[PDB]
UniProtKB/Swiss-Prot annotation, chains C, D:
Substrate binds at W107. One of its GO terms (molecular function) is FMN binding. The keyword Flavoprotein applies. Keywords: Flavoprotein, FMN, NAD, NADP, Nucleotide-binding, Oxidoreductase. Pfam families: FMN_red. Coiled coil: none annotated. NCBIfam families: flav_wrbA, PRK03767.1. It catalyses: a quinone + NADH + H(+) = a quinol + NAD(+); a quinone + NADPH + H(+) = a quinol + NADP(+). Belongs to the WrbA family. PANTHER family: FLAVODOXIN-RELATED PROTEIN WRBA-RELATED (PTHR30546), FLAVOPROTEIN-LIKE PROTEIN YCP4-RELATED (PTHR30546:SF23). The keyword NADP applies. This is NAD(P)H dehydrogenase (quinone).
Amino acid sequence: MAKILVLYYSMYGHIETLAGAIAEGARKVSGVDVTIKRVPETMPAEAFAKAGGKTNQQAPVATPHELADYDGIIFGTPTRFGNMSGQMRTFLDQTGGLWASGALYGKVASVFASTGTGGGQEHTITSTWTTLAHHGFIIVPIGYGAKELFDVSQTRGGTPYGATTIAGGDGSRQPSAEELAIARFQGEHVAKITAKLK
Amino acid sequence: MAKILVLYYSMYGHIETLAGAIAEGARKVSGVDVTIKRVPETMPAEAFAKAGGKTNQQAPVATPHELADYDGIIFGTPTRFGNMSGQMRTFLDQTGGLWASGALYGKVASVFASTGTGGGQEHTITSTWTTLAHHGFIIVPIGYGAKELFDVSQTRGGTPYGATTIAGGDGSRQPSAEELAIARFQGEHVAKITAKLK
Amino acid sequence: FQGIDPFTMAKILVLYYSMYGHIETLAGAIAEGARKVSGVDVTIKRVPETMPAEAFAKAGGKTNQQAPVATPHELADYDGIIFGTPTRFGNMSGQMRTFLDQTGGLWASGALYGKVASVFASTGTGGGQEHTITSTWTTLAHHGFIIVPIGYGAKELFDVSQTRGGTPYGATTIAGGDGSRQPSAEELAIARFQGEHVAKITAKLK
Amino acid sequence: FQGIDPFTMAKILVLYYSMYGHIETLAGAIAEGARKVSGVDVTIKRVPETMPAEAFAKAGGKTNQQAPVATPHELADYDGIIFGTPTRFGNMSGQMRTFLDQTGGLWASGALYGKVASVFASTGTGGGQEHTITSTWTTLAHHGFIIVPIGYGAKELFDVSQTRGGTPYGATTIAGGDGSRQPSAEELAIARFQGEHVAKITAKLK
Ligand SMILES: [Cl-]
Ligand SMILES: [Cl-]
Ligand SMILES: [Cl-]
Ligand SMILES: [Cl-]
C-alpha cells in the first residue's frame, strides 16, 4: 500500500480541476491510496475578495508537517511570474523541521502548474524541483510519455516536466481534454514509480 | 540623476548586512540616490518569535506599488530551499497591477542572496530573474568583474549571477570582507548601468 | 577634430545556428527590428556546423544560408549580441555550445563584459523553449553580459487563441515535430519587437 | 526454467567527460559508491573528444583515460546513468552536449523512458556548478528519466569550514582557476554517497 498526496493551491479553479485529473490517474494504480489537499490562503481578506477568490473547494487544508505521512507527493501551483505561488512557497518554507530530520528524503515528487498565457509554465515546475531536491525527493518528469505532447495544432498545455493548463489572461479558458489526459498520465506514471519503490 | 531601491528580506541579519554593502557600492556613482527598504514579515507571531527573528532592522517597510518609483532595484533574499523566501515571493505576487500597466518595464534589476551552506545560492538568484523577466526588467549579473571571485582558498560567497554570503547551518558565520566587496562591486556596477540608461 | 564630437554607431550582431531554417527566419525578423533603431549597425552571422557530414546529410540539413560564418573572437567587435538557437532537449544546440566554449580567451580578458545580450529560440513542440533561453542566459552571465528579456512588451504574447511561440524571455517559433510549421506573422512580430527593444537599450548604453 | 526465477543485475553506467581529470577522479568515486550496492553491475565510460587537435593539445588535454569511449546508442543498455561533466559557463560541456544531441533516435523510440539518472560536475571556481547539474536535468526530463538529487544525505555538505564542492543537486569538485586542486576527501565522500544512493534506487526500480 502506497499513499500519494496531491497537494495544490488554486485561486481561480484551474489548478483544482487539473488536480482532479492528476488524482484520477494515480488511482488507476492498484494498492495506491490518493488524497487531495490544498495549502492555506495567505492573501489578506480584502485583496482576496477584490480579486474574486473562490471559496467552494472541498479539499481539506493540509498542514506542513503531514507531508511525511505520504510516499509520494504531486505538487500543483499556478505561476506567479515564473515561480510557484506565494501560497505554496510560504507553505513549503514551513517544512524546515521535516528537512532537518530527513523526513522527506527519498520520497517521490512531481509537479503540475497553470499560467494565464503559457509564459513561465516550464520555470514554475523546474524551480519547484529545486526545493524538492533540497529535501532529497526523487523527481519525476513526464517526458513525452503523453502522446498529446506531440500535437501542436491547437493551444494546449503540458510540458515534459509535468502537466500544465493555460487559463487565458482573463481566466476564461477551462482545461482542455488533452491537458487533462496529460495530467491523468502524470498521476498514473508517478503512482507506478511510488508503488514500485514502496 | 537616478533612484535605486535596495529591497531585501532578512530574518537573521545576514542579508541586511549584505544590503548595506550593496548600497555603499551604488552610492559611489555620482547622481544616484539609494534607498534601502525591506519587505514585511509574513510569518505568524509565535513561529517568528520561536525562530528567534530579529526586530532591530532600521530600514522602513516597502509597499508593492512603490517599486515603480525607482529606476533600478537590487533585490536581496535568503534562500528557502533554492527559491526566494516566501516573504519576498508574497511581496512580489502583489505587483500584478504594476505588471499590467508595464510600470516596471525596462527598469534595471539585480539580485543578491544568502544561504546556510551555499546550497541553492545560484538558483535563488536566477529563479528571481524569472520574475524580473516577466516584468521586463533589464537583468544585471556581475560575471567575474569582482576579482574576489577567483580566490577559492577559503569558503566565500558570491557568484557571477550576484553577490551571496554563507551563514553556516547555525547562522554563526558573518559576511566576510571578500563577500562584502563583491556586493559593493555589484551595487556600483548596477548603479552605473542605471544612471547610464536614465 | 575641431568642432566635432564623433558620432559612433552602436553595433548589433545577430548570431544564430539553424539546421532547418526556422531560426534563420526568426533571425531575419530580429535584425529587421534592430534596424528600426537609428544609429544602430546590424550584422547577421551564423556559427559553424559541427555534425559529421554523413549524419548532417542524412538529417537533411540546409546548406543555402547566405549568412557568413562567425569566429569566436569577433564577438568582442559588437556592443550587443542577440543569440538564436534551436533547442536540443531543453539546452542550446551543441553547435552553439561548441562555439561559445571557444570564448574562454574573451572571458579571461573580460572582452565581453558589460555588453548587451538577448536570446531567441525554436523547438519542435514547445517543450523546453523557455529553458533553452534561460540556460543560455547562464553562459551570458558568466561573461558579464547585461541580459535583456522582452517581458510582455509585444501584445501578441497575450493572444492564446492559436499555437504561437514567443515568451517573456525572448522570441521563439514552434517548428512542428516534422519541421513543417513556418514562423507565423505573430511570432515574427514578437521577434521584430525583441530586436528593436534590444537595439534601443544597446544604443542608449553606448 | 523449473524452480528458478531469474535474478537480473541492475546496470549502472557512469558516463563522463573530463578534460583535466577532475571529473574522471569524481567518476571513480561515483562508481565506488554504486558498487557497494549488491546486485548492481557498474560500467564507466567517457564521451568522445570534440575539440580540434591543435586546440586540444595547446590546452593541455589529458590522453591517459583508461575508460572506453561510449556510443550514444548503448545508453539504452543500462537501467541507471550517472552523468559527469565539467562546466562550460554554467552549462554542460560541449563534448557532453554533442554526445547527447545524438540521442534523438533513442528519444523517438522512448528507449530511455523511465530509467534513472543523476548528475555530477566540476568547475574551476565554483561558479555555475549548480546550473551545470540542473540544466543537464532538463535534457534528462525530455527523455523521461527519473531524476535523482542527493539532498543533504551526505553530512559533509553541512561543513562550510573550508572551500568544498558538493550540492543537494549532485556531487561536484572545485578545480581552481588553474586546475591545480584535486578532489578533496570530503568531495569524494559526497560522490561515493551519490553513487550508492542512485544505485539503490535503480536496483529497487528494476
Ligand atoms: Cl488557479
Ligand atoms: Cl537572513
Ligand atoms: Cl533550426
Ligand atoms: Cl575536467
